[PDB]
Amino acid sequence: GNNEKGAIFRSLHRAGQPLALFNVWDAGSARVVADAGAVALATGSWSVAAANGFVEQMPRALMMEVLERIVRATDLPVTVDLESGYGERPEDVAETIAMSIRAGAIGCNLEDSFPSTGELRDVDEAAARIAAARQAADRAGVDYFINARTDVFFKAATETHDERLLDATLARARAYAAAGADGLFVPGLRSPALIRALTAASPLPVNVMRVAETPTLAELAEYGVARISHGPYPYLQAMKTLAALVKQGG
Amino acid sequence: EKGAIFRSLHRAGQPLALFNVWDAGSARVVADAGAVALATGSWSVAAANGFMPRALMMEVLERIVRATDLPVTVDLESGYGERPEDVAETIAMSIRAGAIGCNLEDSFPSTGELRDVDEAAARIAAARQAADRAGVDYFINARTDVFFKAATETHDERLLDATLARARAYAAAGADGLFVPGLRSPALIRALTAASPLPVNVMRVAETPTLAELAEYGVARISHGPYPYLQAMKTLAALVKQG
């Protein structure tokens, strides 16, 4: 049942032995990833939107329909990217999370940026959305993993990534943990020293994104990361293969 | 314009090469890669969506149509309809969805058996009339399963004879193209294209022969079934295994 899937998913967040997730975008891709030995599935908002011909411009109901097809395609635990939570106010984000649970997801990514400007929400406004999500999950009686994404590093040029940004990231992480987040996702962060400092101080299991060849999975694990994401890389590789067939006359 | 463009691309010896797409994202990728038209394939769409009801295919189809300015043809399998009247309705739905052609197959969908020639032709006629009634330039690619269903060892001049007699009945009914999946023999493909009343579509099995070699056989259209989807999923599986 979904609580057992939720428990399995939670248990896989292990500092130094990280959960690696590949984002799927439909039931076919879900099945392929599960058959290739994945231990859980994630959706990615970018991949799902691209697959469906969009640039939270995809309506929530259409995302939920996609999610249900993904969930029923395999027996693996599925986490869903809900972006900023498809809601103006905290109560609206709670409805979104509650709908994700009804759709059969056992966790989410919930991000702290405004879809209008891409700017960060105030720490406590962001935390209030997390708290509403936690409450919705708690009312459902489900074991549900809220992975709180912070865009502190993601929105900053790499050359500006330093201790001040790490400190801002950690202040958000503490607020988000207190509000009921289960994990912290910090995309855009690649510095070994900063990742080490983050995992040493974070109140929550840390998710980082792999983009370049470096750092590698083994390196990230050694820094103490608990979860590794790849964004739309899987979808983009699949589509590269498709485009090359077309050009090669294959 | 889309329909007339698509029709014009069926040139014997200068064939249209079609890749079957299965969602709006794949449609865009293929278009950006230089394709001049797009096809939907039923197997790929079903696979991507976890299989299929007519409504889901039409929903998928509309999203693929809106995704690019290319002409789009849709695989309608046997036509999603018990009687010719029902096939006409499926065609009408596809036109509302923005498709400018279809593949329509002459076999019973639950068994794979061929319909008698007059019943298969009547379904083509109903499709043609539905398109004519809608006032659209719509390309009906009549798929015959003669080589698809029959044992390889019966694949001879007699099976070609059967294929050609069906093609002529289908042409008289309003078909615009003839698709003969399961036909691989170069001698039979050459014989078929020389005698066919309609531009011929063959389906590539392997990467050999080249698009150039097939063109030299006089074919007008070359398709690839679910191969593009399967290759994309191969890459996805490999990525996961590499970690």
Ligand SMILES: [Cl-]
């Ligand atoms: Cl993604």
Ligand SMILES: [Cl-]
């Ligand atoms: Cl960095």
Ligand SMILES: [Cl-]
């Ligand atoms: Cl991700």
Ligand SMILES: [Cl-]
């Ligand atoms: Cl297909």
Ligand SMILES: [Cl-]
């Ligand atoms: Cl043959």
Ligand SMILES: [Cl-]
């Ligand atoms: Cl095909």
